[PDB]
Amino acid sequence: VHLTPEEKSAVTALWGKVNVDEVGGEALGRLLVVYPWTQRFFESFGDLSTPDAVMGNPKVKAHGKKVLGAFSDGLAHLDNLKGTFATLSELHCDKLHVDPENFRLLGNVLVCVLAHHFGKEFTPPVQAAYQKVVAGVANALAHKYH
Amino acid sequence: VHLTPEEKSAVTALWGKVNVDEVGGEALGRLLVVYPWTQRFFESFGDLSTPDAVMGNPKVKAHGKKVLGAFSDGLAHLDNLKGTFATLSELHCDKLHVDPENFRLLGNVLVCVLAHHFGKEFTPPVQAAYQKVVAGVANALAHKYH
Amino acid sequence: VLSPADKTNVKAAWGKVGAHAGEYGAEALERMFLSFPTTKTYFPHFDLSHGSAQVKGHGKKVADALTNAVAHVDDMPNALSALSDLHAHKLRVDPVNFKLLSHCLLVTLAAHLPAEFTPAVHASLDKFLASVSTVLTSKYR
Amino acid sequence: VLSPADKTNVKAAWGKVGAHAGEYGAEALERMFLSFPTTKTYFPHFDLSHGSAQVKGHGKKVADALTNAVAHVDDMPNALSALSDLHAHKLRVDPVNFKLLSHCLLVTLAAHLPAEFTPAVHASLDKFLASVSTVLTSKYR
Ligand code: HEM
Ligand code: HEM
Ligand code: HEM
Ligand code: HEM
Ligand SMILES: *Cc1ccc([C@@H]2CCCCO2)o1
Ligand SMILES: *Cc1ccc([C@@H]2CCCCO2)o1
C-alpha cells in the first residue's frame, strides 16, 4: 500500500491514541453482531447469544486485542504485507476456510469503530488513508487463496 | 490454477466439444441480461435494451468469441493461469476498473451455459472441475488487484 | 425485487419441475457438495456419499420449500419464517453458501429443462433464488 | 428482511440526523469519493472538489431520500420506484458501489452519533441500507 507522507503521519498519529484494550474487541464483537454467521468460527468462545453478551465476552475482547495487534504489525510493515501476514493467511485460508469477503467486512468494521471512538477527528481524508490500510491487510490475509 | 490430473482430463475432454463460435456470445449475452449493470461497460455495443436485443447483438456475439478464445487459452495452460491472463488483468483492473465479483459472475454464467448445452453430460464431477477453472480464471484476471 | 414478469417466469419454469422436485433438489445438493466441498461442514452428521438416501430426502425438502416460496412469492418472509429460524438464527449460514446452492440449482435446471432456461427466465430465476436466500439468512424476529 | 426491532432502531437513529441531513449526506459522499475513487466515474458532470456546492446539494437529496425510505420501510419498492428507475434502469450502477456508500454512511453516523451507534443499531442500519440498495439496483417494473 502507498500512503503519502501526509497520510502516513495522520494514520500514525491517530493509531497512537487507539485504546488497545478495547478497540480490537469492539471491532471483532461488531463483526459477530452485524454478520452473525461469523460466529460459527468462534464456537469455543462461549456466550455469543445476544449483542451484549458478544461485546462483553472476555474471549472476544482478548481475541480482538490479537486482531488489533495484527493491524499494528501491518501498519509497521506497509511495504511487505504479504510477508508480514503469510503465517496468518495460511491459518485463515487453508485451515479455517474464511471466505475472503469476511476479511473485508472486518476491516471496514474496524473503520467504523475508529470513527466511533474518534468522532470528528476521523476525517474523510483520514478514513481514505485507513481504507488503503485495511484493503492492504485484507488482501494480504487472502494471499494464500490467490 | 491447480486441478487434479483427473479434473484436467475432464475439462479438456469436454472443451473439445464446445462450439467456439457460439458459447462465448451466449455467456456474454446472459451476463448482460442476468446482471444488467454490466451493460454499462459496453456502451458502444448498440442495442442492449431487451434480452432479445442483447442475445441478437452482433457486437455481443463477436466479443463473446474473443472472451471464449481467452478461456481456451487458459484451458491450454491450466497451471499458468496468472501468466496467461496478465495482460487482460491490466486491461480489466487498471484500465476498465471492473469489480472482480463480475469476473466470478461471468465464470458461473459460462458454467450455466455449459450445463444448458450439454445437459446430463454436464455431470456433477464435470461441473466441479469447471468450477475450479472459472475460479482460477477469475482469480487470474483479478491479479492486478492483488 | 421481483417484477411481474419475474414472478410469471419463475412460476412457469418451476411449474415444469413438478414430480422431479426431489430429484433436482438432490442433484443440486450433490453438485454443491462436490463443487464447493466446504459446504459439507454444515452437514457434519449427514451421509453425503453419492446417491445417499439422506441427500435424496433432503433435496426433496429443499425443492418443496422452493415450491412453497413460489406459491408465496409476495409473502415470502411470512411463508419462510421457520426456515429463516433454522438457517439464520441457529445454523448461521454464511450467505456466500446460498449463492453456491443457488448457482447449482440454476445449473441443475439448465441441464434438465433447456427449452425453458431462456436468458429472461435465467435472469428471473436468479433474482428469485437471491430473494429466497435473503429471507433465509436474515433474522427478522 | 427488517425485523420490528430493526425498524425501530433505524427510526430512532436516523431520526437524530434532523437538520444535519445535508451535512451528513454530503460527508458520506465525500468519504465515498475520497476513499473509493472509482465511484467518481458515475459523476463525471459533477464538480467533485471538496466543499463543492454541487456535492453538498446532492448530499441533501441523498439524506432526504433515506428519510423517505425510513418513513416507508414497509413499502420501499413502491416508495422508491423513481430512484430505482434512475439507479437501475438509467445509470446501471454496479451494486458494489452501493456497499461502499452504505459503509460511508455508517462511518458518518458513527462519527457524529456515537450514542446512537450501538452494536444492535449498527446491525439494523446495515440491513436497512442493504435493503435500500437492493431496491435501487433491481429492475422490478
Ligand atoms: C481481516 C483481518 C483479520 C485479521 C488481521 C485477523 C487476525 C487474527 C489473529 C492475529 C489471530 C490469532 C492467530 C493465532 O493465534 O495464531 C486470528 C485467529 C483467528 N481468526 Fe482472524 N483475523 C482476520 C479476519 C478473520 C475473520 C473475518 C474471521 C472469521 C469470520 C477470522 C477467524 C479467526 C479464527 C477462528 C481464529 C482462531 C481463533 C481461535 O483461537 O479459536 N479471522 N486472527
Ligand atoms: C472473467 C472472465 C473474462 C475474460 C476471460 C475476459 C476476456 C476479455 C477479452 C479477451 C477481451 C478483449 C481484449 C482485447 O482484444 O484487447 C476483453 C475486453 C473487455 N472486457 Fe472482458 N473478460 C472477462 C470478464 C469481464 C467482465 C466481467 C467484464 C465487465 C462486467 C468485462 C468487460 C470488458 C470490456 C468492457 C472489454 C472491452 C470491450 C471493448 O472493446 O470495448 N470483462 N475481455
Ligand atoms: C434455496 C436455498 C435453501 C433452501 C430452500 C433451504 C431449505 C431447507 C429445508 C426445507 C430444510 C429442512 C428443514 C426441516 O427439516 O425442518 C433445510 C435444512 C438445512 N439446511 Fe437448507 N436451504 C437452503 C440453503 C442452504 C444452504 C446454502 C446451506 C449450507 C451450505 C443450508 C444448510 C442447511 C442445514 C445444515 C440444514 C439442516 C440439515 C439437518 O441437520 O437436518 N441450507 N434447508
Ligand atoms: C443508499 C443509496 C443511494 C441513495 C439513497 C441515492 C439517492 C439518490 C437521489 C435522491 C438522487 C437524486 C435523484 C433526483 O432527485 O433526480 C440520486 C442521483 C444519483 N445517484 Fe444516487 N443514491 C444512492 C446510491 C448511489 C450510488 C452508490 C451511486 C454511484 C456510486 C449513485 C449514483 C448517482 C448518480 C450518478 C446520480 C445522478 C446525479 C445527477 O446527475 O443529478 N447513487 N441518488
Ligand atoms: C430483488 C429482491 C431481493 C430480495 C427481495 C425480497 C426479499 C424479501 C421478500 C421477497 O423479496 O427482493
Ligand atoms: C433484509 C432485506 C434485504 C432486502 C430486503 C427487501 C428488499 C426489497 C424491499 C424490502 O426489503 O430485505
DSSP string, C58-119: HHHHHHHHHHHHHHTTTSHHHHTHHHHIIIIIIS---HHHHHHHHHHHHHHHHHH-TTT--H
The answer, yes or no, to whether any atom of ligand 2 lies below 6 A from the CB of B66, is yes
Query: Distance (Å, rounded) from C-alpha D3 to C-alpha C131?
Result: 16
Q: Is C89 annotated as a binding residue?
A: no
Q: Quick one: residue A119, left, alpha or beta (phi over 0 = left, psi -120 to 50 = alpha)?
A: left
Cα distances (angstroms) measured from residue C11 to each of C43, C72, D84: 30, 10, 24
Domain extents for chain A? 1-146
Query: Distance (Å, rounded) from C-alpha A81 to C-alpha A68?
Result: 15
C-alpha cell at position A68: 488489533
Query: Distance (Å, rounded) from C-alpha B102 to C-alpha B39?
Result: 12
Mapping DSSP onto H, E and C, the string for C29-58 reads HHHHHHHCHHHHHHCCCCCCCCCCHHHHHH
Residue C139 to residue A37, Cβ atoms within 8 A: no
Q: CB of B116 within 8 A of CB of C114?
A: yes
| Segment A73-77 long-range contacts (CB within 8 Å, at least 24 positions apart) | A74/A133, A74/A136, A74/A137, A74/A140, A75/A11, A75/A12, A75/A15, A75/A133
Q: CB of C17 within 8 A of CB of C105?
A: no
Number of structural domains, chain C?
A: 1
Residue C96 to residue A101, Cβ atoms within 8 A: yes
C-alpha cell at position C7: 414472478
Residues in chain B: 146
Resolution (A): 2.0
Cα distances (angstroms) measured from residue D97 to each of B94, D41, D54, D93: 17, 11, 20, 7
CA distance A36 to chain C (A): 6
The chain D residue lying nearest B50, using CA atoms, is D89
Query: Distance (Å, rounded) from C-alpha D57 to C-alpha C6?
Result: 36
C-alpha cell at position A67: 486482531
In the 8-state DSSP scheme, what is residue A94? I
Q: CB of A111 within 8 A of CB of A138?
A: no
Nearest residue to B4 via CA among B142, B137, B128 = B128
Residue A124 to residue D126, Cβ atoms within 8 A: no
Q: Nearest ligand, CA of residue D126?
A: 6
Give the nearest partner residue to A124 out of D31, D117, D122, using CB atoms.
D31
Neighbour count for residue B21 (Cβ, 10 Å): 11
Q: Nearest ligand, CA of residue C97?
A: 3
The answer, yes or no, to whether any atom of ligand 5 lies below 6 A from the CB of D19, is no
The chain D residue lying nearest B48, using CA atoms, is D89
The chain D residue lying nearest B33, using CA atoms, is D139
Ligand 5: atom nearest CA of C127 is 1
- Mutual orientation of helices B23-34 and B58-75 as an angle, nearest 10°? 110
Spell out which residues of chain A touch residue C96, defining contact as CB-CB under 8 Å. 99, 101
Residue B30 to residue C122, Cβ atoms within 8 A: yes
A99 in contact with chain C, both atoms CB, cutoff 8 A: yes
The answer, yes or no, to whether any atom of ligand 5 lies below 6 A from the CB of C135, is yes
Residue C96 to residue A97, Cβ atoms within 8 A: no
Phi and psi dihedrals of C115, rounded to 5?
-60, -35
Burial class (CB in 10 A: 0-12, 13-18, 19+), A86: middle
In the 8-state DSSP scheme, what is residue C2? -
Nearest residue to B115 via CA among B50, B41, B26, B39 = B26
Q: Nearest ligand, CA of residue B92?
A: 2
Query: Distance (Å, rounded) from C-alpha D102 to C-alpha A71?
Result: 23
Q: CB of A14 within 8 A of CB of A126?
A: yes
B64 in contact with chain C, both atoms CB, cutoff 8 A: no
C-alpha cell at position B93: 483492473
Neighbour count for residue D83 (Cβ, 10 Å): 17
Spell out which residues of chain A touch residue C137, defining contact as CB-CB under 8 Å. 37
Domain of residue C25: give its range.
1-141
Query: Distance (Å, rounded) from C-alpha B100 to C-alpha B95?
Result: 13
The answer, yes or no, to whether any atom of ligand 2 lies below 6 A from the CB of B30, is no
Compute the half-sphere exposure of residue A84: CA atoms within 13 Å on the CB side of its CA.
18
D51 in contact with chain A, both atoms CB, cutoff 8 A: no
